[PDB]
């Protein structure tokens, strides 16, 4: 009757489809498709556009950083406030905890999950849901970032 | 018995000094935060030693 | 060439811990209570 109730929500995802990356697909083969290879004879091994995607998302999403802000931007958290900085710092470090990640294994070719626990139900499948749209987003920015740069 | 250990552990946790853990992970830079070293290291792998040593080694990412 | 440039990237960035690793001492107070 003590102990704080958890409520669990589990997601699993994978790589995206060609059609939902949008122009960044054709602004990263106009880069590696054409340039570096014709024009500098490389010649490396590189994953696909859509795996990259996928790692970064993936990298982005079980990053702690990515929890902390995450974390510090919902009202789930700013409402259960109290005014103590250790209190504060302490629900903090239990919150982002809160959020676990299990990486896909290729031998029982499995899947990348992560699980949200929260104290209600409704909290626990919305977070999880706009947790992982700004994991997506935060990787999207990056990738961006990246093709500028290059 | 078991008071007297108790004491003195206690004591002992009084007298060691308090060790505080801060951990941190990192991984490979972007592209864009190595600056100028990234047209420097191309300049100087990409065209010159290939084209003109034809070396043919394997060699990692600049980042 | 450049004086300083950022050679690494923030996955887990430094914080300010929550709980001491040492001491710890209800760890340090059942341990050796019960050892005695």
Request: hydrophobic content about 35%.
């Amino acid at each position: 009757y003590l102990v704080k109730q958890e409520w669990g929500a589990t997601s699993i995802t994978d790589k995206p489809t060609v059609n939902m990356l949008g122009g960044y697909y054709s602004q990263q083969q106009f880069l590696r498709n054409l340039d570096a290879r014709s024009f500098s004879s490389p010649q490396p091994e590189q994953p696909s556009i859509s795996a990259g995607a996928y790692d970064e998302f993936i990298m982005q999403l079980a990053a702690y950083d990515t929890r902390r802000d995450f974390w510090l931007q919902t009202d789930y958290y700013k409402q259960r406030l109290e005014g103590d900085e250790k209190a504060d710092a302490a629900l903090l470090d239990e919150l982002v905890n809160n959020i676990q990640f299990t990486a896909r294994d290729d031998g029982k070719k499995t899947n990348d999950s992560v699980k949200l626990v929260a104290e209600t139900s409704s909290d626990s499948n919305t977070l999880l849901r706009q947790y992982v749209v700004f994991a997506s987003q935060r990787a999207a920015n990056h990738l961006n970032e990246e093709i500028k740069g290059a | 018995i078991g008071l007297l250990f108790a004491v003195v552990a206690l004591g002992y946790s009084y007298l060691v000094k308090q060790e505080w853990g801060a951990t941190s992970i990192t991984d490979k830079p972007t592209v864009n935060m190595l600056g100028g070293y990234y047209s420097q290291q191309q300049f100087l792998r990409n065209l010159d030693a290939r084209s003109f040593s034809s070396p043919q080694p394997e060699q990692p990412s600049i980042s | 060439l450049e004086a300083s440039f950022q050679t690494y990237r923030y996955l887990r960035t430094p914080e300010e811990p929550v709980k001491r690793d040492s001491p710890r001492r209800a760890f340090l107070m059942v341990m050796w209570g019960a050892i005695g």
